[PDB]
Design an enzyme around this catalytic site. Sequence first.
Site, PDB file in Angstrom:
ATOM      1  N   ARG A 220      60.692  38.505  44.653  1.00  0.00           N
ATOM      2  CA  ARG A 220      59.933  38.619  43.406  1.00  0.00           C
ATOM      3  C   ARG A 220      60.859  38.516  42.206  1.00  0.00           C
ATOM      4  O   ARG A 220      60.469  37.976  41.166  1.00  0.00           O
ATOM      5  CB  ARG A 220      59.125  39.922  43.357  1.00  0.00           C
ATOM      6  CG  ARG A 220      59.950  41.207  43.412  1.00  0.00           C
ATOM      7  CD  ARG A 220      59.116  42.448  43.046  1.00  0.00           C
ATOM      8  NE  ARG A 220      59.914  43.674  43.137  1.00  0.00           N
ATOM      9  CZ  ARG A 220      59.566  44.849  42.613  1.00  0.00           C
ATOM     10  NH1 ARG A 220      58.428  44.972  41.943  1.00  0.00           N
ATOM     11  NH2 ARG A 220      60.362  45.908  42.758  1.00  0.00           N
TER      12      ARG A 220
ATOM     13  N   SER B 220      55.304  44.560  38.070  1.00  0.00           N
ATOM     14  CA  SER B 220      55.393  44.512  39.525  1.00  0.00           C
ATOM     15  C   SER B 220      55.565  43.097  40.062  1.00  0.00           C
ATOM     16  O   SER B 220      56.380  42.877  40.967  1.00  0.00           O
ATOM     17  CB  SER B 220      54.141  45.135  40.159  1.00  0.00           C
ATOM     18  OG  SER B 220      54.098  46.540  39.956  1.00  0.00           O
TER      19      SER B 220
ATOM     20  N   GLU C 295      41.298  39.671  39.352  1.00  0.00           N
ATOM     21  CA  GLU C 295      41.964  38.632  40.135  1.00  0.00           C
ATOM     22  C   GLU C 295      41.080  37.399  40.299  1.00  0.00           C
ATOM     23  O   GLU C 295      41.544  36.268  40.111  1.00  0.00           O
ATOM     24  CB  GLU C 295      42.383  39.170  41.510  1.00  0.00           C
ATOM     25  CG  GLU C 295      43.403  40.306  41.464  1.00  0.00           C
ATOM     26  CD  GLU C 295      42.763  41.663  41.209  1.00  0.00           C
ATOM     27  OE1 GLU C 295      41.523  41.758  41.238  1.00  0.00           O
ATOM     28  OE2 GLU C 295      43.503  42.636  40.972  1.00  0.00           O
TER      29      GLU C 295
ATOM     30  N   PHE D 205      45.630  41.023  47.236  1.00  0.00           N
ATOM     31  CA  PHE D 205      44.484  40.732  46.388  1.00  0.00           C
ATOM     32  C   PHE D 205      44.277  39.250  46.169  1.00  0.00           C
ATOM     33  O   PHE D 205      43.377  38.868  45.411  1.00  0.00           O
ATOM     34  CB  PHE D 205      44.619  41.522  45.090  1.00  0.00           C
ATOM     35  CG  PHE D 205      44.796  42.979  45.366  1.00  0.00           C
ATOM     36  CD1 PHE D 205      44.070  43.568  46.400  1.00  0.00           C
ATOM     37  CD2 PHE D 205      45.717  43.735  44.688  1.00  0.00           C
ATOM     38  CE1 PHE D 205      44.231  44.896  46.712  1.00  0.00           C
ATOM     39  CE2 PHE D 205      45.882  45.076  45.002  1.00  0.00           C
ATOM     40  CZ  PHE D 205      45.145  45.647  46.017  1.00  0.00           C
TER      41      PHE D 205
END
Length: 627
Positions: free
Chosen positions: A323, A350, A376, A402
Amino acid sequence: SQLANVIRFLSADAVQKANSGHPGAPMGMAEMAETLWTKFLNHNPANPKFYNRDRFVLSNGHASMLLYSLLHLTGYNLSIEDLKNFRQLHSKTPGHPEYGYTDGVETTTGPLGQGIANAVGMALAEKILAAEFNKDGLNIVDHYTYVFMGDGCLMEGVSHEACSLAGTLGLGKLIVLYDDNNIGWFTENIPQRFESYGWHVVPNVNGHDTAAIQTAIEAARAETGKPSIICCKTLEATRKHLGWAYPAFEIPQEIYDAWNAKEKGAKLEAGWNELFAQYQAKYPAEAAEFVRRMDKKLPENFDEYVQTALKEVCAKAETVATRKASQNSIEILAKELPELVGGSADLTPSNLTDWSNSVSVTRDKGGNYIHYGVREFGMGAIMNGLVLHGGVKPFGATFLMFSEYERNALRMAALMKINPVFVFTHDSIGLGEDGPTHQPIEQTATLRLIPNMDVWRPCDTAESLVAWAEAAKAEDHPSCLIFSRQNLKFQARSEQQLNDIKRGAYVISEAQGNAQAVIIATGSEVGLAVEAQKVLAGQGIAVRVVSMPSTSVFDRQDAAYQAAVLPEGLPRIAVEAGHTNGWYKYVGLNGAVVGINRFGESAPADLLFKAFGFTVDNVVDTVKSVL
Ligand SMILES: [Ca+2]
Ligand SMILES: [Ca+2]
Ligand SMILES: [Ca+2]
């Protein structure tokens, strides 16, 4: 009167001939359609890709004959014979309108709710591009986004997400005509709901009175600070009763002449071309960038730029979470792609999706970063609209779990052959304590089954940059980029291995000696596979390690390359912190898989990997078991 009736009965006649589809919805919206398309919609049938055309979205895509009728009557390359082939195999008139197949269709709609979200994205792109490109009164970006939507659309949660966000961002050029065809399960006060989103509302419009509809649209256009919803109350024998007595598919010349838009469309685009010439004289570099980006083309030096950046990423050899490698790749790409527009579904700290120069889009200003909120599905379908518009290349992130909230938007991007970039972080039990509601197990495996979708699960900073660059390069398909929460060890590579990352799988560590098996690993599990190879070598068992950052891409490599990576007769063992069942396509009945097929657990990540068998001993034993 007859200008609306021709749409009405072209639709009913094509539905009848097909013996499939619903005629009531296109028939009820005919005056709405006639009013918008003859009095307001700025389009050029001679050039359906005219940069400054108004965008129309038929969100209730089942009413597709309404759109087909409008395209035919106004002069697009859609004929009576095409309408006679409604819903027939390989015809130009499939049951739901298909972007890229039929001239003038701006988006593929069918699944309800996503059309309005697509339109929000198109209006957002117009707003972003206008803020970026318009200069001292030379407003080369200046057009509206019109939507027809129905009750099904409004019940869907994705309409709540998209219209809520559109309200916050004050999208005053987004104008919705709602087919309120009602007199049990739907009793919402739609005007009150949309007031609560901050929209401008025109309630109780007679949906069969063109004068009333035109006045309502005028009021919507004057409300420049808020999106508008206009609540349109709608309601052979009916044929000659409503005054249309021509037989099926017969249309008199006088009506074609009144409906044809080629003369007006040509004058529209000519007028815009004169404005763009004034712009190009004063802002030639900006003008050239506008054409490039509206044409959905990359900078000429993209590949050489990426190649240079990759060599620098390797010089750093950082062990970080991917990430963070993603955020680093975004920084690199953003320098080269001014069209880049990022965002996240309330997970910016995040997902690590902003970069040093991201500017948040607001109600009053443009930017290149969208805070989608906890939305989302809205994000995914809005991104589809952003990319359909031209001029921007969007990405948007959430946790991999998600993806399930926005799943059909991902599929619709793949079906439309468009290239939004869906970013996902926190990709496995490696996310740790948040536990099994958040820990992906099967999500990566399910995403790989979407036709025309590339799924990337890079193992380090080098694979992450290549995955990002390949996703950005892809012209006609989306990509899912899947990144880890926990740090991943950088792998050393030759120049040839670096260049083979883009082929989806490659030999990252050859056997010392004749290979007795091959370990296939992805993402966070490559390090584990390499460590198992070393332990096996110390036992006199030579295996090769293959990194497979994208199954999708590997599967379309030529047969000779795939055999060079995975030789016939060499036992295969796959290692991935996810469901095993997709790997049998590769390892077969006599190979093996180290994965996880049950729900995760709330605990620190290091403990979870050990508890679920992602250990050197287990990989080594599993390899031995197929020898
Ligand atoms: Ca509907
Ligand atoms: Ca209804
Ligand atoms: Ca438990």
